[PDB]
Design an enzyme around this catalytic site. Structure first.
Site, PDB file in Angstrom:
ATOM      1  N   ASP A 169       8.878 -24.552   1.278  1.00  0.00           N
ATOM      2  CA  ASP A 169       9.382 -24.054  -0.002  1.00  0.00           C
ATOM      3  C   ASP A 169       9.907 -22.635   0.143  1.00  0.00           C
ATOM      4  OD1 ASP A 169       9.038 -26.119  -2.187  1.00  0.00           O
ATOM      5  OD2 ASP A 169       6.996 -26.109  -1.355  1.00  0.00           O
TER       6      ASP A 169
ATOM      7  N   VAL B  59      11.249 -19.290  -2.610  1.00  0.00           N
ATOM      8  CA  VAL B  59      10.375 -19.453  -3.776  1.00  0.00           C
ATOM      9  C   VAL B  59      10.623 -18.356  -4.795  1.00  0.00           C
ATOM     10  CG1 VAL B  59       8.583 -20.666  -2.430  1.00  0.00           C
ATOM     11  CG2 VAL B  59       8.396 -18.208  -2.791  1.00  0.00           C
TER      12      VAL B  59
ATOM     13  N   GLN C 108      13.450 -17.210  -5.912  1.00  0.00           N
ATOM     14  CA  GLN C 108      14.505 -17.472  -6.884  1.00  0.00           C
ATOM     15  C   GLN C 108      14.093 -18.484  -7.942  1.00  0.00           C
ATOM     16  OE1 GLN C 108      17.205 -20.678  -4.379  1.00  0.00           O
ATOM     17  NE2 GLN C 108      18.245 -18.904  -5.267  1.00  0.00           N
TER      18      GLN C 108
ATOM     19  N   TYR D 120       6.298 -29.357  -7.818  1.00  0.00           N
ATOM     20  CA  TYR D 120       5.168 -28.481  -7.592  1.00  0.00           C
ATOM     21  C   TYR D 120       5.352 -27.106  -8.202  1.00  0.00           C
ATOM     22  CZ  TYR D 120       1.941 -31.155  -4.778  1.00  0.00           C
ATOM     23  OH  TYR D 120       0.983 -32.069  -4.354  1.00  0.00           O
TER      24      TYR D 120
END
Ligand SMILES: [NH3+]CCc1ccccc1
Ligand SMILES: [NH3+]CCc1ccccc1
Ligand SMILES: [Cu+2]
Ligand SMILES: [Cu+2]
Ligand code: NA
Ligand code: NA
Lengths: 620, 620
Positions: free
Chosen positions: A290, A296, A298, A374
């Protein structure tokens, strides 16, 4: 005035202007990453040079570029064409999320697969999943996403409850070709909905919770100056923000009397990987980074007062670039507050008659990010007593599949027909240490059991042993919970009043590391995740444990290549990389939306101070 | 009306009257333990029989007695004379704390040792330490305490800063004889003071902490009925209190719809041991069982609002017996409150547009105890999502020694000349399980790595394996952090909607267990502490992992003797005993008063519910 200040909208607009004027940002270009660079070792010249690193994607198919810009002097410093077949592709673009679904909706093989299942193509959402590197030679040098499908019965339906198993497609997002469509067979689409706001599912809401009110009638005990410099209960630090890593902590230091003592030069979560353990061909390629692949930062949420952050909250609103170089604010993206933390120290003495109680508190710096199904919260904690702690909170919706008839060894059943493949969530913390300065070393500390015999006649003795890690080739370490293994970062040139080197002890949770076979593609691409602790000698360009371009890199970049230099780390400028993670066998209680689970690590002073540092805390 | 209600002052007075009238509590008798007995299995007769167990010491030297009293019928049920040479001595009496110092102050050998050190006997405090069982045959059948000395420079001085090393004495507290005085040599008495309220040591107190105000404007969300029955966010339980174990949790259960589902029948910390790892003859015998030998409940602190417990606090004030059978209240001994606990669940969905956030909270039940230099907080937590957690908080003052010249492998130096021997703090949680009822079983769950090959061509698969523990002889288990080992307690006769047995998963911290040599006296007396997990079949009289009379028992009582019965535990009324602890290598920051360190365990639902149990939690 500080070189560690957050990027401003004006700086990002100036980067956009510099690139435009230099011919590097025409209409076919897209910014896939933009971030400020830290000052080099030796910023004592006060000559402020705010520099930015930019990854520029070309939608026409030309080769991408890595560009470094000096915003202070208004110049391009360097611009290199990238060979993505060798060094990896650029991070996924937000605008490519849609492209997978749209291309597939006009492909005959995809439409035929949906028709066989009596699925309306207008209901079928397609997740844009990173491709990795496997056995498809035709993908080398191409920008590939893979697509897995879920049915949305209506626009406010949770698509995750309706996976379409047995089906997967590969898409070239630059040339807009569907390269392959694989249909291994029909599975029933699970029918139960997973709509956690549907009163038919929730039942009537509880009325039993009464309010908890947390206020600070005199405001908070911390101060924010210069936009992002924090002073709190003898701690001092700068809160940075990077679109890839998220919140970054700089210049963590502690005021010990009249002296400001450094502890950590830079702290970040430099990578995170979610490998899946389902051997089905539909999902056996599935591992998303991720951080490295999606960025992550942004996807950080705007955090709501009284819902996401409760208490007397101070916000930061970091600025990042969109794909065209325009500034965009993440409003209320970082929450910042102090929390009561129970008893700090307590003693009632039978001989002196003195009763003594003091309360603890912690400073909290956090953000939340959402990438697809998630959601993760990243929490940094600073405590009165010198402890530093990180905590990841994992929640959101579990990634689903069909649950096969006759069961599975690699998938949990969550609802009738609905499965959740086994997976891990593995993080890499990058800790650029500066314990009392930059001359640091790492020792591995083990408990030592002793045998009954002479000098230990009653068989009660036990001890400990410390092993100095002197070169990078011996600085790849594994946990050993049974022997209480920890790691101490010390400064052999700075001694406490007992003439011992000052230090900090790293306490790991000792959860399992990467479970995949050591010969697998993911073990090569996420090699950092196979060991608990790595120590490297600091270098400007060694920023991520997986390398700069994770997307579709064949493996071996990052930490294994760094430590192969076998540099001296005994009393040097060093970096600690700690791997930690959760192994998730999904449970029924994780469905339809999963309660938070946590993992992390902490660092506690080990003879850093000359006595307890909280003797001057007052009674409440 | 409830048989699990707290003992009242009236009940204790009635016990005192029954014993007096029966001839069992004359002026030479002392009550060393008094506690209510739990109802037997089958209290559905509603015939309330409040029974009390009493250990009666005889100061004239006659044999002690174990007596069971029925307060309801006003009768003595049973009275047995104890052979303490066989079954162990009674717990230490509070009134024996002074006797060690007083006897030694008139012994010529003690006075000679102090004179050689130029110590004023009126300044020398003597800690009353439990004796254990070693090589002194003359101690078998005698009530022995051992004494270690510390200098108090003035009445409000912290004696712990001035250990008198090289000296130890053994005292028979019944016959009032000093049996031995051992002087291995003179050590300097450390001179620095450790007075943490002395402004010369603390410096000026911080003025930077601003208040944190936690209030509940509508009061708390839990209700207390019947004195000690708690209802909170679908949880129901009874809070008991025992002078040996402290806070005891009974009938923990969760309201799942209209049905009250049991989870845990009885939860307690049934033992705790602090073994020392210094091989010096002065301290190599030193292991105190604060629970079994000293009784931690009788040393519970009165907890102050806004200092010990912060927020909207509900107190319980348990009643215990003094040494003569008079009731004595522990005012504000148990604090009870709910706490905000961050994000419970959170998802922002890219396809449905729904943003969802819910907050967590926990119910807290705690007490603090002080036994000599050490102070411990015991915290039970109940969470919205079904999680149960225990946390021990260790603080107080570390036990000290001299720091030898030329160093030590078994002692940390805290200040010039001042050492702190290495030790552990090891706890035993006794969990009488009742998952959906009393037919329970335990499975050990390990992660299973899989090799690259057919059926796993990409080398990504991993799985898990569960092993049922079917008989007590195979139910002594060790941790394995590397394979993610946990234990599941399930009810094979109660299934969730997926037709799987309902269960709860025990997550351990996987800290080291007892480090002493397996042939040592402490390994035999604290055998529970050598393994992480024990499962026994429930029996009324199997209450403590070390047996009923820990003081000066030679070893082997408790768990090793229980499991030797090799009873059937596969779908039966079972008890889980979990060992967990801290290994303490003292650091400079632990001096002069130590910041809290923690350890514990937690249990999370594992397919107990049919979906997440917190879908009905409202938005804040
Ligand atoms: N988390 C990165 C993978 C992903 C991205 C978008 C939707 C679902 C999953
Ligand atoms: N904690 C039990 C041992 C103890 C008892 C009294 C003083 C010091 C130590
Ligand atoms: Cu997960
Ligand atoms: Cu300790
Ligand atoms: Na460094
Ligand atoms: Na049971």
């Amino acid at each position: 005035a500080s070189p560690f200040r957050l990027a401003s909208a004006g700086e990002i607009s100036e980067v956009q202007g510099i690139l435009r004027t230099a011919g590097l940002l025409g209409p076919e270009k897209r910014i896939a990453y933009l971030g400020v660079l830290d000052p080099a070792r030796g910023a004592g010249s006060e000559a402020e040079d705010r520099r930015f690193r930019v990854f520029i994607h070309d939608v026409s198919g030309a080769r991408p570029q890595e560009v470094t810009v000096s915003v202070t002097n208004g110049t391009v410093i360097s611009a290199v064409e990238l060979d993505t077949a060798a060094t990896g592709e650029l991070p996924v673009l937000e605008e490519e999320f849609e492209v997978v679904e749209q291309l597939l909706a006009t492909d005959e093989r995809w439409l035929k697969a949906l028709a066989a299942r009596n699925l309306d193509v207008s209901k079928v959402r397609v997740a844009p999943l990173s491709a990795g590197v496997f056995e498809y030679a035709e993908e080398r040098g191409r920008r590939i996403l893979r697509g897995l499908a879920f049915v949305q019965d209506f626009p406010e339906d949770s698509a995750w409850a309706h996976p379409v198993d047995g089906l997967v497609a590969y898409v070239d997002v630059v040339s807009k070709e569907v390269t392959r469509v694989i249909d291994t067979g029909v599975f029933p689409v699970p029918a139960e909905h997973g709509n956690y706001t549907d009163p038919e599912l929730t039942g009537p809401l509880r009325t039993t919770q009464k309010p908890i009110s947390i206020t600070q009638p005199e405001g908070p005990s911390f101060t924010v100056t210069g936009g992002n410099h924090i002073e709190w209960e003898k701690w001092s630090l700068d809160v940075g923000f990077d679109v890839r890593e998220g919140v970054v902590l700089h210049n963590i230091a502690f005021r010990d009397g009249d002296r400001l003592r450094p502890i950590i030069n830079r702290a970040s979560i430099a990578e995170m990987v979610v490998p899946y353990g389902d051997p089905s061909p539909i999902r056996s390629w599935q591992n998303y980074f991720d951080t490295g692949e999606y960025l992550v930062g942004q996807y950080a949420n705007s955090l709501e007062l009284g819902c996401d952050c409760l208490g007397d909250i101070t916000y930061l609103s970091p600025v990042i670039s969109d794909a065209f170089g325009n500034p965009r604010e993440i409003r209320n993206g970082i929450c910042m507050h102090e929390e009561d933390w129970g008893i700090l120290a307590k003693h009632s003495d039978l001989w002196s008659g003195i009763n003594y109680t003091r309360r603890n508190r912690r400073m909290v710096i956090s953000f939340f990010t959402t990438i697809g199904n998630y959601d993760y919260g990243f929490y940094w904690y600073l405590y009165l007593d010198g402890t530093i702690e990180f905590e990841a909170k994992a929640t959101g919706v579990v990634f689903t599949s069909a649950f096969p008839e006759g069961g599975s060894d690699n998938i949990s059943q969550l609802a009738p027909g609905l499965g959740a493949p086994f997976h891990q969530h593995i993080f890499s913390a990058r800790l650029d240490m500066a314990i009392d300065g930059f001359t640091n070393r790492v020792e591995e500390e083990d408990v030592v059991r002793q045998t009954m015999g002479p000098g230990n006649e009653r068989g009660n003795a036990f001890s400990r042993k410390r092993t100095v890690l002197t070169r990078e080739s011996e600085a790849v370490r594994e946990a050993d919970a049974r022997t209480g293994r920890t790691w101490i970062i010390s400064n052999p040139e700075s001694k406490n009043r007992l003439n011992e080197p000052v230090g900090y002890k790293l306490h790991a949770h000792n959860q399992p590391t990467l479970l995949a076979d050591p010969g697998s593609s993911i073990a090569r691409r996420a090699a950092f995740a196979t060991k608990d602790l790595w120590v490297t000698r600091y270098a400007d360009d060694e920023r991520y444990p997986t390398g700069d371009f994770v997307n579709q890199h064949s493996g071996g970049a990052g930490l294994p290549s760094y430590i192969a230099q076998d540099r001296d780390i005994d009393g040097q400028d060093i970096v600690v990389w700690h791997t930690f993670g959760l192994t998730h066998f999904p449970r029924v209680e994780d469905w339809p939306i999963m309660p938070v689970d946590t993992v992390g690590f902490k660092l506690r002073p080990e003879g850093f101070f000359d006595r307890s540092p909280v003797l001057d805390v007052p009674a409440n």
